């Protein structure tokens, strides 16, 4: 799972999966981007792999 930081817990289903759908622009670390689209420009959220 992931920890998500939101620019203005965060619902990660709003981030489109790879080839998926969503309502928020998300970017993240390498693990996040392996499963989710990573769209850095005007990103609403940054998500990184949760250690532990």
């Amino acid at each position: 799972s992931f920890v998500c930081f939101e620019h203005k817990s965060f619902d990660i289903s709003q981030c489109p999966k790879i080839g998926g759908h969503g309502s928020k622009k998300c970017t993240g670390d390498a693990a996040f981007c392996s499963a989710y689209e990573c769209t850095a420009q005007y990103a609403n959220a940054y998500c990184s792999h949760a250690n532990g």
Partner: antibody
Amino acid sequence: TGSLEESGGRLVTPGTPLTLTCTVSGIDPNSDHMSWVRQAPGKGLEWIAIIYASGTTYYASWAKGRFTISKTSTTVDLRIASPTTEDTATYFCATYPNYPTDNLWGQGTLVTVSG
Amino acid sequence: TGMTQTPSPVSAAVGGTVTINCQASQSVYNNYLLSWYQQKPGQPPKRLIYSASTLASGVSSRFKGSGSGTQFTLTISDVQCDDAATYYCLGSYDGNSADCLAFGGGTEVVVKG
């Protein structure tokens, strides 16, 4: 700051392959999912294909096998492999419709297929 | 697989309220990933609404979207002559199982001045 501009629309005979180009300005290379959409004169909007930031592509069920969507750092291209008179339309490119950023559309490029 | 909108024309007197309906045979992805568009002749469509009910930047508060799952409505209040146009819903679906994106057939608004 962002805008889109379609080019490559022209009159061709049926079966003449045709590539259309969407030139992107002010938008980062892998930060949106770009679609092509068309509209025949007097008819509704028809979604054709999408290319995600990841490079993943989908096509409308009717479009599969007849159209190819591709991208570079500054363009999104649509190849129409074997046009028919039914493909006569204005072709638009558009950004991903569910994001909260401005949904950008170009002015469109006009394709005419005729003998 | 089928997206049906209100048949054209919808006739709206100036100052009145109009509703346009969009119905999907399947639920849209995550139930609210549905957007609405206005198209005037000679122009590309302009997005009015996304996430079923969120107003896009620049758009008049006279436009409202509601609904979820398979049933959605665009309401135009205090209808003006400038609202004469064709309005389209756009649904999102799993691209592996259906069309990734699908437009309804469009609904023309004729304004009675």
